[PDB]
Design a protein around this nucleic acid. Structure first.
Ligand SMILES: Nc1ncnc2c1ncn2[C@@H]1O[C@H](COP(=O)(O)OP(=O)(O)OP(=O)(O)O)[C@@H](O)[C@H]1O
Ligand SMILES: [K+]
Ligand SMILES: [Mg+2]
Ligand SMILES: [Mg+2]
Ligand SMILES: [Mg+2]
Ligand SMILES: [Mg+2]
Ligand SMILES: [Mg+2]
Ligand SMILES: [Mg+2]
Ligand SMILES: [Mg+2]
Ligand SMILES: [Zn+2]
Lengths: 175, 135, 118, 47, 50, 59, 217, 76
RNA sequence: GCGGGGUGGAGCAGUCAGGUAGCUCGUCGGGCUCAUAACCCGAAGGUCGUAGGUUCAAAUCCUGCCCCCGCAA
RNA sequence: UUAUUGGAGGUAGAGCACUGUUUGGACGAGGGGCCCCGGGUUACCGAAUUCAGACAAACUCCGAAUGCCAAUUAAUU
RNA sequence: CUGGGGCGGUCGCCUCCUAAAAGGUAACGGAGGCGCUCAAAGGUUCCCUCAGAAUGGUUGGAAAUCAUUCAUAGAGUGUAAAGGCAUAAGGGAGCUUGACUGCGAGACCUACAAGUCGAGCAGGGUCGAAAGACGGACUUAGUGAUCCGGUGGUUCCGCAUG
RNA sequence: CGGAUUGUAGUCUGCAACUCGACUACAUGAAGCUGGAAUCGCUAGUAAUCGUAGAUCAGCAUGCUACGGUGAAUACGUUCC
RNA sequence: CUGGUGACUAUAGCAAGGAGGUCACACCUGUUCCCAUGCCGAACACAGAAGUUAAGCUCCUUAGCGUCGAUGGUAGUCGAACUUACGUUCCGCUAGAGUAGAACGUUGCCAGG
């Protein structure tokens, strides 16, 4: 549980010395990671669904929830009940396993890595990756199929300030 | 002058008794026109009056109409026995009760304002008087 | 993130239960309150707001080191003994806005088994 | 969507009328309903 | 056809022949109906003008 | 964690032998594992980074 | 009027035909099961655009000949271009798979509106494509098999007893489609009068031996 | 013209006033929806009528500023 | 105000009963020919007036709007 | 019938708290015509927000007088 | 029927307003719907709370799906409108068939015929640990007299007797 | 298979190869699976195919002019164009 | 005083600031059996108490939003007397808005101190 331990001792030390909190329970943590795939090509063909559904499972080690429309639109021909692919929620040791399997592994597999954004916080201390090349996870085996689909990751935290978000993510290893 | 859209084109024709629910105290400008009597006022009358004032005054001048004809009114086709529904629309009216300010004007002296609003008063079905602001 | 008050969602549920069940002297209701440490319990008529009995897992000879569900069972026995005297044979169980699976269920079974038969 | 007569599977008495989609519930539909002769709640199919 | 069992004395050729004549008879009667209706509606319109 | 929906997901030990960045985690590979570029091998995280004018003045 | 149904119109989504010098070849295919010479070891070859046919009495081995084509290479020589569409003499579909849609879309990668439109040309309406495949009548099972095997990505069709339960006014659409198909077809049928339009390389199995000529007569 | 219709009226409203003696099963307030809620010894019908269940005396009451109720209380 | 219609350039089917937009003439390029016409071979040309909904699917059903034809006025 | 008490109900009025209408302003949310990817505009401003003033049978945050329904009450009839 | 008749329109039912703060109230007065639907969109037990805006984020109005914060109702409530529902009547899940039998004090409306509500008793039950809920649906339309004939059942008669 | 196109690096000529020469090496590797209605040439060392040479010319030829190597098929016959 | 739980039209609320904790309640440690999530022990539930008052909770102050809200006066109006005027006169009731102002809750039962 290397990264839990890392966070608890070293990063907590650094960050509370930095921000001068009155207690540890002020310190921000991560409540969840949320993956999304968000694909409207299933109006066309539903094989698309089961494909990305399987790849999400392969990545996160757990089956994904299928998201569904709630309202209908005529441009995309999207209607209440037709799924738009899937999400996943992750919290626990799965959270940290996924964090590391990004930072140590696949974000170095970026083709052109100029750090990563300093702006992509909503304004509460909570971050998104809009990922392009979904096969930078190993287990896809992208010979069989080539629609990467991209992906969205959403890290969610108990921080107030985007500053604290940046600094905690820095202590994780994210630019 | 019309509304762009209304829910019910065939309304009841409004009440004329009483006095103003508001629009009595001159607000925007310096001078105004105040009804002493009750009648209806139309798009046509308003256009005419506003034209009259804006011609009597040079480009130096500012006008605020203070009423709008929300309420439509009907008239039947010609040479038609009574009944058989309710007629089409032929106009739009603002009701006016005594007290209410019809026009307000700012960018001039009181003599010019008096003459302009005098010229306009003759193009409405209503007796008017000339108003200045209060304390 | 804003964290959520379990007590408040519970009480919002409690009200929906209490819309139906109210109690009376003929049969009062068995108030139940839970906490991460231990349980409090009352038996009350709500025509007058007059708690007819009480027992708690806090201040008693019931208090022991096991905050196990058995301590809930003993709260049940305690209100059973302390209430059967006062002429209370039947009652309306209050779920409390909790769920009837654990400590709540254990207290209820205890009270049933201790003569305070619903 | 059509009219439906039920009937008890141990006497043969109808005892109930109702309605059903002939599309969505196409089969000979069956439900447990009181039967006034046996004085027991009994399985009643359609006829 | 649509649950209606039509019966036909003879051979499959006779089926073809009989159904052919029946199709033809039906189309003709339909054309007659449409034509007549058209005519009477036109009459109605003229008479209303007057 | 239910039973019947999750695939196998056990512990695994990654390795960037380009610097032997040897690391522990969990995955679905089925426990000796390769890595090719990582934090201690990538130009950003490691800091390192590998003209017509010059080309013309060569000649 | 009678609400007259629109006619049968079958489709083949596309064959980007290449017409190259040969599609199939094989040599000395020992035709037997056990103790029975069903046919002699013989060669064969099928070329770009061939409306190959087969004619044989009962218990000959036409079906097994087609099975040798579709599986195994004993004395056979295939290429990676040919992608067979196998229509069986049996069902070949999933009986209680919960929709014609599913059982078809299993083997094809096309849009829902095109596939339901093709089914509608076959006269399987909006609320009928969710019917189970066991419930169905024979002729419409045959039609659904054919649609699945069309919208399969294929260029050569392999049809053991089509036209079998179908009706006189879909067999004509099928006649014309096969007449007009830019690609290769191989098939069995006992209807010489159906074959009159279709065949270009007629075959004949008999007396444990084989013959193969070209054109009709 | 495209109009000229309306439906029968249904005689909604109060049918037994306040401070009044009422027998069981007596309609009090026919309505549509809970224009008025029930109270004590009052039931709400399928069509939202309000009927007494016991003999007694009617009292319309308050239930929080946009919500009334009605209670049939016994007498002695 | 009432009633019918608007589908490549022209005229017509298809709308009733929703399932891949069709017919004749024409247009464009090429052929034949001393050249043009005819004729032969290919190809373009259609948000089915428009804007909204229903539908897996709209020329098709529903809504709204702009024109066209008669009647009237 | 009146006195008293209580009660249901949404009218005239009034108001804009929703529904729609509407004036003049302050910003604007970003488009559009036009000029040279970006940047301009004596302009629509679809909107959002806000200040002030206004409209309503089928709007109401509010809400009369009357009328009504009754009362273990009194009086006159 | 009808501001003569006639044409045009309408004829029965449901909801608003006219309708004058009980109820009721007309007109060829103004606006709209109905002639169904649902074996769950019913019953019950558990749980959940929306729409919309700002921001961050791939296929980009970032409108598809996601994350957060705001947001008390502007969503949804099968379907017209009104009255109501967020202590849910709205949305999911598990089990079931009370969309039961015989009735029914007392009431509303009411010319009549009809229509509506209905506790409660008994029988035999689904759900819930129990209390208890349940004689369809958030409510109000979603219908058609008698004669006649058809079908089934029956401790009913059966032209002297059977 | 074919070798278009484009990228880089080079060689020769020249007063200088952007417009605008040829050539090379490397990289890339398009269209094209023997051509619709129509239509051309050829009767023998011809047609067909493979190379070579030369004038113009600093340099540039799939063209022109000329050379050889291999080497056919058929001509019933004049009914038709 | 804390906690539980009822009652009253938010005068009770929203908002801002500040404060307290091992006796409560909380966050909190984990999925160990009951139990559970169209996926995750987030939730639900359970074995817990190493840890922290940060947050939730509760308490103090403030009248910025919301709520409540007079008197006086006004519109309106039953009735009456005159008259037909887009009305007046007399009496009785009596708004709505607003203005001053109220208010940052109060009690009832029970276990603890
Ligand atoms: N498993 C088996 N065991 C024994 N004999 C078999 C087996 N399978 C097939 N056969 C025989 O092999 C021959 C196969 O006949 P097949 O179906 O190929 O003929 P066909 O040309 O399709 O004729 P048709 O369909 O008109 O009968 C027949 O004799 C059949 O009886
Ligand atoms: K005048
Ligand atoms: Mg009902
Ligand atoms: Mg008014
Ligand atoms: Mg009003
Ligand atoms: Mg008349
Ligand atoms: Mg007359
Ligand atoms: Mg009334
Ligand atoms: Mg007899
Ligand atoms: Zn029975």
């Amino acid at each position: 549980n290397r990264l839990k331990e890392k966070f608890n001792t070293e990063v907590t030390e650094n960050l509370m010395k930095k921000f001068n909190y009155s207690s540890v329970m002020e310190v921000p943590k991560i409540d969840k990671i949320v993956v999304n795939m968000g694909v409207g090509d299933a109006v066309q063909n539903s094989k698309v669904l089961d494909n990305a559904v399987e790849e999400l499972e392969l990545i996160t080690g757990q089956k994904p929830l299928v998201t569904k429309a709630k309202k209908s639109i005529a441009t995309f021909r999207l209607r209440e009940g037709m799924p738009i692919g899937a999400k996943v929620t992750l919290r626990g040791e799965r959270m940290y396993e996924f964090l590391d399997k990004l930072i140590s592994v696949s974000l170095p597999r970026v083709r052109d890595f100029q750090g990563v954004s300093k702006k992509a916080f909503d304004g509460r201390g909570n971050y998104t990756l809009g990922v392009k090349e979904q096969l930078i996870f190993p287990e896809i085996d992208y010979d069989k199929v080539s629609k990467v689909r991209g992906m969205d990751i959403v890290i969610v935290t108990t921080a107030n300030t985007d500053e604290e978000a940046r600094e905690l993510l820095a202590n994780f290893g994210m630019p | 002058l019309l509304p762009k859209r209304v829910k019910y084109r065939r309304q009841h024709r409004p009440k004329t008794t009483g006095r103003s629910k508001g629009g009595n105290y001159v607000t925007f400008g310096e001078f105004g026109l105040q009804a002493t009597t009750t009648s209806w006022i139309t798009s046509r009358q308003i256009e005419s009056a506003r034209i009259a004032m804006t011609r009597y005054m040079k480009r130096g001048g500012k006008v605020w109409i203070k009423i709008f004809p929300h309420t439509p009114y009907t008239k039947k086709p010609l040479e038609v026995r009574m009944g058989a529904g309710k007629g089409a629309v032929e106009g739009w009216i603002a009701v006016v009760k005594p007290g209410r300010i019809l026009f307000e004007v700012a960018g001039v002296s009181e003599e010019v304002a008096r003459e302009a609003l005098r010229l306009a008063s003759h193009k409405l079905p209503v007796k008017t008087k000339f108003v200045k602001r209060e304390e | 993130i804003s964290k959520i008050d379990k007590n408040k969602v519970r009480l919002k549920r409690h009200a929906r239960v209490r819309t139906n069940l109210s109690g009376t002297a003929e049969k009062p209701r068995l108030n139940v309150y839970r906490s991460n440490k231990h349980i409090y319990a009352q038996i009350i008529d709500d025509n007058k707001g007059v708690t007819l009995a009480q027992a708690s897992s806090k201040d008693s000879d019931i208090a022991t080191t096991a905050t196990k569900v058995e301590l809930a069972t003993k709260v049940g026995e305690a209100i059973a003994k302390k209430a059967a005297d006062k002429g209370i044979k039947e009652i309306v169980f209050d779920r409390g806005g909790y769920l009837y699976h654990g400590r709540v269920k254990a207290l209820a079974e205890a009270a049933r088994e201790s003569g305070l038969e619903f | 969507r059509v009219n439906v007569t039920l009937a008890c599977t141990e006497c043969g008495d109808r005892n109930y009328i109702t309605t059903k989609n002939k599309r969505n519930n196409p089969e000979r539909v069956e439900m447990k309903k009181f039967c006034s002769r046996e004085n027991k709640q009994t399985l009643h199919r359609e006829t | 056809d649509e649950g209606r069992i039509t019966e036909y004395k003879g051979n499959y050729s006779n089926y073809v022949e009989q159904k052919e004549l029946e199709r033809h008879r039906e189309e003709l009667e339909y054309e007659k109906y449409e034509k007549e209706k058209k005519r009477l509606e036109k009459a109605i319109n003229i008479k209303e003008q007057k | 964690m239910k039973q019947g929906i999750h695939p196998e997901y056990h512990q695994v030990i990654f390795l960037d032998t380009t610097t032997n960045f040897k690391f522990l985690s969990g995955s679905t590979k089925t426990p000796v594992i390769r890595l090719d570029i990582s934090s201690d091998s990538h130009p950003f995280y490691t800091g390192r980074q590998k003209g017509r004018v010059e080309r013309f003045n060569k000649k | 009027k009678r609400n007259e149904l629109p006619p049968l119109k079958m489709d083949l989504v596309n064959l980007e035909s290449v017409k190259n010098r040969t599609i199939i070849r094989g040599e000395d295919v020992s035709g037997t099961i056990e103790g029975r010479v069903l046919w002699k070891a013989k060669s064969f070859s099928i070329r770009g655009g061939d409306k190959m046919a087969i004619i044989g009495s009962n218990g000959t081995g036409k079906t097994t000949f087609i099975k040798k084509i579709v599986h195994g290479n004993p004395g056979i020589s295939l290429s990676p271009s040919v992608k067979i569409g196998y229509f069986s003499q049996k069902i070949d579909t999933l009986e209680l798979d919960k929709s014609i849609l599913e059982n078809v879309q299993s083997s094809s990668q096309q849009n829902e509106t095109l596939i339901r439109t093709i089914l509608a040309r076959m006269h399987f309406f909006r609320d009928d494509v969710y019917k189970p495949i066991s419930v169905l009548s024979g002729g419409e099972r045959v039609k659904v098999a054919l649609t699945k095997v069309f919208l399969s990505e294929v260029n050569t069709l392999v049809l053991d007893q089509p036209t079998n339960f179908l009706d006189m006014e879909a067999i004509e659409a099928f006649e014309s489609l096969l007449k007009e198909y830019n690609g290769s077809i191989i098939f069995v049928s006992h209807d010489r009068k159906f074959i009159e339009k279709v065949a270009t390389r007629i075959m004949t199995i008999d007396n444990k031996e084989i013959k193969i000529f070209d054109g009709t007569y | 013209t495209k109009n000229g219709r309306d439906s029968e009226s249904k005689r909604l409203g109060a049918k037994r006033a306040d401070g009044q003696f009422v027998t069981g099963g007596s309609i009090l307030y026919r309505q549509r929806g809970t224009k008025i809620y029930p109270g004590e010894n009052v039931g709400r019908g399928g069509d939202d009528t309000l009927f007494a269940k016991i003999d007694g005396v009617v009292k319309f009451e308050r239930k929080g500023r946009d919500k009334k109720q009605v209670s049939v209380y016994a007498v002695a």
